[PDB]
Scaffold this motif. Structure first.
Motif, PDB file in Angstrom:
ATOM      1  N   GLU A  47      52.713  42.266  43.629  1.00  0.00           N
ATOM      2  CA  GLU A  47      52.802  40.747  44.116  1.00  0.00           C
ATOM      3  C   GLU A  47      51.617  40.027  44.022  1.00  0.00           C
ATOM      4  O   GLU A  47      51.659  38.987  43.212  1.00  0.00           O
ATOM      5  CB  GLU A  47      53.015  40.966  45.673  1.00  0.00           C
ATOM      6  CG  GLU A  47      52.809  39.578  46.514  1.00  0.00           C
ATOM      7  CD  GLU A  47      54.081  38.834  46.372  1.00  0.00           C
ATOM      8  OE1 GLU A  47      53.888  37.512  46.442  1.00  0.00           O
ATOM      9  OE2 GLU A  47      54.961  39.390  45.975  1.00  0.00           O
ATOM     10  N   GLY A  48      50.303  40.580  44.208  1.00  0.00           N
ATOM     11  CA  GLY A  48      49.037  39.695  43.997  1.00  0.00           C
ATOM     12  C   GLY A  48      48.641  39.599  42.524  1.00  0.00           C
ATOM     13  O   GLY A  48      48.271  38.545  42.061  1.00  0.00           O
ATOM     14  N   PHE A  49      48.884  40.731  41.759  1.00  0.00           N
ATOM     15  CA  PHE A  49      48.655  41.132  40.468  1.00  0.00           C
ATOM     16  C   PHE A  49      49.196  39.746  39.505  1.00  0.00           C
ATOM     17  O   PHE A  49      48.561  39.416  38.555  1.00  0.00           O
ATOM     18  CB  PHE A  49      49.219  42.206  39.883  1.00  0.00           C
ATOM     19  CG  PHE A  49      48.913  42.562  38.462  1.00  0.00           C
ATOM     20  CD1 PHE A  49      47.745  42.608  37.572  1.00  0.00           C
ATOM     21  CD2 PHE A  49      50.248  42.676  37.616  1.00  0.00           C
ATOM     22  CE1 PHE A  49      47.602  42.630  36.388  1.00  0.00           C
ATOM     23  CE2 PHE A  49      49.851  42.556  36.072  1.00  0.00           C
ATOM     24  CZ  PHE A  49      48.559  42.736  35.567  1.00  0.00           C
ATOM     25  N   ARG A  50      50.531  39.719  39.811  1.00  0.00           N
ATOM     26  CA  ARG A  50      51.239  38.533  39.073  1.00  0.00           C
ATOM     27  C   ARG A  50      50.593  37.132  39.263  1.00  0.00           C
ATOM     28  O   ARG A  50      50.646  36.121  38.371  1.00  0.00           O
ATOM     29  CB  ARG A  50      52.686  38.424  39.480  1.00  0.00           C
ATOM     30  CG  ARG A  50      53.578  39.906  38.762  1.00  0.00           C
ATOM     31  CD  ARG A  50      53.436  39.983  37.245  1.00  0.00           C
ATOM     32  NE  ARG A  50      54.122  41.213  36.905  1.00  0.00           N
ATOM     33  CZ  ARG A  50      54.143  41.822  35.762  1.00  0.00           C
ATOM     34  NH1 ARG A  50      53.100  41.239  34.654  1.00  0.00           N
ATOM     35  NH2 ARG A  50      54.835  42.715  35.469  1.00  0.00           N
ATOM     36  N   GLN A  51      50.313  36.837  40.443  1.00  0.00           N
ATOM     37  CA  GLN A  51      49.438  35.437  40.586  1.00  0.00           C
ATOM     38  C   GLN A  51      48.028  35.484  40.195  1.00  0.00           C
ATOM     39  O   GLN A  51      47.439  34.361  40.117  1.00  0.00           O
ATOM     40  CB  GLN A  51      49.645  35.136  42.181  1.00  0.00           C
ATOM     41  CG  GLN A  51      49.297  33.837  42.446  1.00  0.00           C
ATOM     42  CD  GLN A  51      50.313  32.928  43.315  1.00  0.00           C
ATOM     43  OE1 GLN A  51      50.714  33.437  44.402  1.00  0.00           O
ATOM     44  NE2 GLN A  51      50.591  31.784  42.826  1.00  0.00           N
ATOM     45  N   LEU A  86      44.778  32.851  36.019  1.00  0.00           N
ATOM     46  CA  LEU A  86      43.885  32.610  34.818  1.00  0.00           C
ATOM     47  C   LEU A  86      44.663  32.135  33.765  1.00  0.00           C
ATOM     48  O   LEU A  86      43.743  31.339  32.889  1.00  0.00           O
ATOM     49  CB  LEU A  86      43.856  34.311  34.355  1.00  0.00           C
ATOM     50  CG  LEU A  86      42.969  34.570  33.123  1.00  0.00           C
ATOM     51  CD1 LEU A  86      41.387  34.022  33.230  1.00  0.00           C
ATOM     52  CD2 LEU A  86      42.914  36.238  32.536  1.00  0.00           C
ATOM     53  N   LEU A  87      45.989  32.366  33.445  1.00  0.00           N
ATOM     54  CA  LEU A  87      46.639  31.566  32.176  1.00  0.00           C
ATOM     55  C   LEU A  87      46.492  30.044  32.676  1.00  0.00           C
ATOM     56  O   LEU A  87      46.386  29.358  31.604  1.00  0.00           O
ATOM     57  CB  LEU A  87      48.201  32.019  32.405  1.00  0.00           C
ATOM     58  CG  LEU A  87      49.029  31.425  31.400  1.00  0.00           C
ATOM     59  CD1 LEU A  87      48.713  31.573  29.917  1.00  0.00           C
ATOM     60  CD2 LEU A  87      50.448  31.866  31.777  1.00  0.00           C
ATOM     61  N   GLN A  88      46.886  29.676  33.931  1.00  0.00           N
ATOM     62  CA  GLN A  88      46.629  28.308  34.370  1.00  0.00           C
ATOM     63  C   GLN A  88      45.309  27.544  33.828  1.00  0.00           C
ATOM     64  O   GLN A  88      45.112  26.589  33.232  1.00  0.00           O
ATOM     65  CB  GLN A  88      46.567  28.118  35.791  1.00  0.00           C
ATOM     66  CG  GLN A  88      46.421  26.654  36.284  1.00  0.00           C
ATOM     67  CD  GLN A  88      47.640  25.884  36.547  1.00  0.00           C
ATOM     68  OE1 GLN A  88      47.657  25.397  37.805  1.00  0.00           O
ATOM     69  NE2 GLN A  88      48.472  25.925  35.676  1.00  0.00           N
ATOM     70  N   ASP A  89      44.219  28.557  34.093  1.00  0.00           N
ATOM     71  CA  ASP A  89      42.644  28.182  33.863  1.00  0.00           C
ATOM     72  C   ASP A  89      42.609  28.198  32.368  1.00  0.00           C
ATOM     73  O   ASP A  89      41.841  27.169  31.914  1.00  0.00           O
ATOM     74  CB  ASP A  89      41.707  28.875  34.614  1.00  0.00           C
ATOM     75  CG  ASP A  89      40.265  28.373  34.800  1.00  0.00           C
ATOM     76  OD1 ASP A  89      40.371  27.339  35.410  1.00  0.00           O
ATOM     77  OD2 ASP A  89      39.502  28.994  34.038  1.00  0.00           O
ATOM     78  N   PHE A 130      44.913  34.291  22.317  1.00  0.00           N
ATOM     79  CA  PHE A 130      44.831  35.042  23.382  1.00  0.00           C
ATOM     80  C   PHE A 130      45.970  35.859  23.063  1.00  0.00           C
ATOM     81  O   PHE A 130      47.091  35.563  22.822  1.00  0.00           O
ATOM     82  CB  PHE A 130      45.234  34.033  24.489  1.00  0.00           C
ATOM     83  CG  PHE A 130      43.779  33.103  25.002  1.00  0.00           C
ATOM     84  CD1 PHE A 130      42.985  33.900  25.820  1.00  0.00           C
ATOM     85  CD2 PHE A 130      43.866  31.873  24.588  1.00  0.00           C
ATOM     86  CE1 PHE A 130      41.846  33.155  26.062  1.00  0.00           C
ATOM     87  CE2 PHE A 130      42.868  31.034  24.928  1.00  0.00           C
ATOM     88  CZ  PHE A 130      41.952  31.791  25.853  1.00  0.00           C
ATOM     89  N   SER A 131      45.825  37.170  23.447  1.00  0.00           N
ATOM     90  CA  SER A 131      46.879  38.363  23.811  1.00  0.00           C
ATOM     91  C   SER A 131      47.150  38.195  25.382  1.00  0.00           C
ATOM     92  O   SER A 131      46.461  38.698  26.204  1.00  0.00           O
ATOM     93  CB  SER A 131      46.226  39.729  23.428  1.00  0.00           C
ATOM     94  OG  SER A 131      46.447  39.839  22.086  1.00  0.00           O
ATOM     95  N   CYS A 132      48.312  37.790  25.501  1.00  0.00           N
ATOM     96  CA  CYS A 132      48.887  37.908  26.940  1.00  0.00           C
ATOM     97  C   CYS A 132      49.561  39.307  27.238  1.00  0.00           C
ATOM     98  O   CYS A 132      49.424  40.111  26.550  1.00  0.00           O
ATOM     99  CB  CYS A 132      49.914  36.810  27.107  1.00  0.00           C
ATOM    100  SG  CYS A 132      49.639  34.913  26.589  1.00  0.00           S
ATOM    101  N   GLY A 133      49.469  39.357  28.827  1.00  0.00           N
ATOM    102  CA  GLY A 133      49.945  40.355  29.283  1.00  0.00           C
ATOM    103  C   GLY A 133      51.359  40.927  28.858  1.00  0.00           C
ATOM    104  O   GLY A 133      52.245  40.051  28.371  1.00  0.00           O
TER     105      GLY A 133
END
Ligand code: SKM
Length: 114
Positions: free
Chosen positions: A14-18, A23-26, A37-40
């Protein structure tokens, strides 16, 4: 703290995805130019994260998809003892994610002689 450690505590998935989304937002606004960037692996299954990637590549991007064979990508993740019993099969994850990767991608590259 580490990523696997986040999965165990009250956070969970739940919290991990947010945690990714923020971070992606920032990163998109602050580190906007001059980085790579290497995304998840699962960034793409947060609905709001898809909107950010799509919004990014619609006005210049770029967002590169890397996809080896669907058999070889599977056996890299199957060959990894860190995996809970009764967790999602990798086939069903990849097949559900495939259309989202394309949607969220600007560019594509696979090795012509793998
Ligand atoms: O397959 C996934 O959804 C993940 C891949 C890794 O990159 C990490 O983002 C995390 O272990 C989740």
């Amino acid at each position: 703290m580490t990523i696997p450690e986040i999965i165990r505590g009250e956070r969970g998935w739940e919290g991990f995805r947010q945690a990714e989304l923020e971070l992606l937002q920032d990163v998109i606004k602050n580190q906007s130019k001059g980085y790579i960037f290497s995304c998840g692996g699962g960034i793409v299954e947060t609905e709001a994260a898809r909107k950010l990637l799509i919004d990014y590549h619609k006005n210049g991007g770029p967002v590169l998809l890397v996809h080896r064979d669907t058999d070889q990508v599977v056996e890299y993740l199957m060959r990894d003892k860190t995996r809970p019993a009764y967790s999602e099969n990798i086939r069903e994850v990849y097949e559900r994610r495939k259309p989202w990767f394309y949607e969220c991608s600007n560019l594509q590259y696979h090795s012509p002689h793998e």
